[PDB]
């Protein structure tokens, strides 16, 4: 029974290695990683791989690993797939812990833009969780944390993290992680998966997929939002992504908005993440 070596980048930046039978479905590997992580609330997470075009793809747990990674290495990342709109409602602290690690990467990466003050507040909760109560012994006027807090670090940001850290004395890791999440969840790009597209006129837009629905970012002024209760249906055909929108009350016919994606695989990928978000967040 022939087994393939799998390497998984975990959210703390470490590598987990295991073997699975070469015809294994993605669920097999996912269950191994979640068991390793002592994670029970698995529904919010998934594994990603990089395709031959270097795009992030979700490993479908129902399909053979080999028919997804195809010619590529059996190398994966463990990630949050469905960002909960209300992390306080997760049943376990360890779930909230992995969600914090994902969000810290979302922030450092620049995927999740954040004000100076929110970067410092989020950083101060991470420090409280990881080091516990503020200690001046590991902090002179020239302190710079090992912790990555932001896409670009400044001495002013380091200083503000420490000032807020001082205010958190007695806070437990679970408490600091909950505070991190109560702040992070309000950011306008929290749990937004962004896809480059062109509108029907050929203007470059971004399409966002999240818990609430679909967002079209035309520019900083003019963002169209389609709550899942407003989207009737979605479709991909060749390079084309189409969204069908319900009519307003006392109007006969749904409207269609068409988008042009880079290639057929990018159209399919957007369609699949939309269907998955719609299913998940219809039910949740
Ligand atoms: C105005 C508000 C606060 O955000 C009231 O709850 N709802 C939304 O903005 N919903 C939404 C729809 C589609 C995509 C993203 C968000
Ligand atoms: C089976 C299929 C696949 O596309 C076609 O009807 N379902 C959807 O598209 N469901 C959907 C509904 C509202 C919002 C987003 C997706």
Going by CA atoms, what residue is nearest to atom 2 of ligand 1? 212
Output the six-digit token pair for 131.
Answer: 């080091």
**Which of ligand 1's atoms lies nearest the C-alpha of 225?**
13
Q: What is the resolution of this structure in A?
A: 1.8
How would DSSP label each residue in 235-257?
EEETTEEEEEEPPPTT--S-EEE
Is 174 strand, coil or helix?
Answer: helix
| Residue keyed to tokens 């795009």 | 55
Half-sphere exposure of 87 (CA within 13 A, CB side): 27
Kindly give the distance from the C-alpha atom of residue 202 to the centroid of ligand 1, in angstroms, as a whole number: 26
Residues 6+ apart with CB under 8 A from 250: none
Say how far apart CA 230 and CA 247 lie, in whole Å.
Answer: 8
Say how far apart CA 229 and CA 208 lie, in whole Å.
Answer: 16
**Which of ligand 2's atoms lies nearest the C-alpha of 275?**
16
Say how far apart CA 115 and CA 137 lie, in whole Å.
Answer: 29
| CA dist list (Å): 181 to 83, 192, 258 | 11, 15, 35
Say how far apart CA 104 and CA 148 lie, in whole Å.
Answer: 8
- Phi, psi of 204, deg, nearest 5: -75, 120
| Residue keyed to tokens 């028919």 | 67
- Phi, psi of 164, deg, nearest 5: -75, -35
């Amino acid at each position: 029974p022939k087994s393939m070596q799998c390497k998984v980048i975990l959210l703390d930046g470490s590598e987990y290695t295991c073997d699975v039978e070469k015809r294994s479905r993605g669920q097999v590997l996912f269950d191994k990683v979640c068991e390793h992580l002592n994670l029970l609330e698995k529904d919010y997470f998934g594994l990603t791989y990089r395709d031959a075009e270097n795009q992030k793809n979700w490993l479908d747990p129902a399909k053979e690993i080999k028919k997804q990674v195809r010619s590529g290495a059996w190398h994966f990342s463990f990630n949050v797939k469905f960002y909960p709109p209300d992390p306080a409602q997760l049943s376990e602290d360890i779930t909230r812990y992995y969600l914090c690690l994902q969000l810290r990467d979302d922030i450092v990466s620049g995927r999740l833009p954040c004000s100076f003050v929110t970067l410092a507040l989020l950083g101060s909760y991470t420090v409280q969780s990881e080091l516990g109560d503020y200690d001046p012994d590991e902090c002179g006027s020239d302190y710079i944390s090992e912790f990555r807090f932001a896409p670009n670090h400044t001495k002013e940001l380091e200083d503000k993290v420490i000032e807020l850290h001082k205010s958190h004395r007695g806070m437990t890791p679970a408490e600091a992680e909950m505070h991190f999440l109560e702040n992070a969840k309000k950011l306008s790009m929290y749990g937004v998966d962004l896809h480059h597209a062109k509108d029907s006129e050929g203007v470059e837009i971004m399409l966002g997929v999240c818990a609430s629905g679909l967002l079209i970012y035309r520019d900083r002024l003019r963002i169209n939002r389609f709550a899942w209760p407003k989207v009737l249906k979605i479709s991909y055909k060749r390079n084309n992504f189409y969204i069908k929108i319900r009519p307003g009350e006392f109007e006969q016919f749904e409207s269609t908005i068409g988008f042009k994606l880079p290639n057929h695989r990018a159209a399919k990928r957007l369609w699949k993440v939309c269907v998955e978000h719609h299913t998940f967040f219809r039910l949740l």
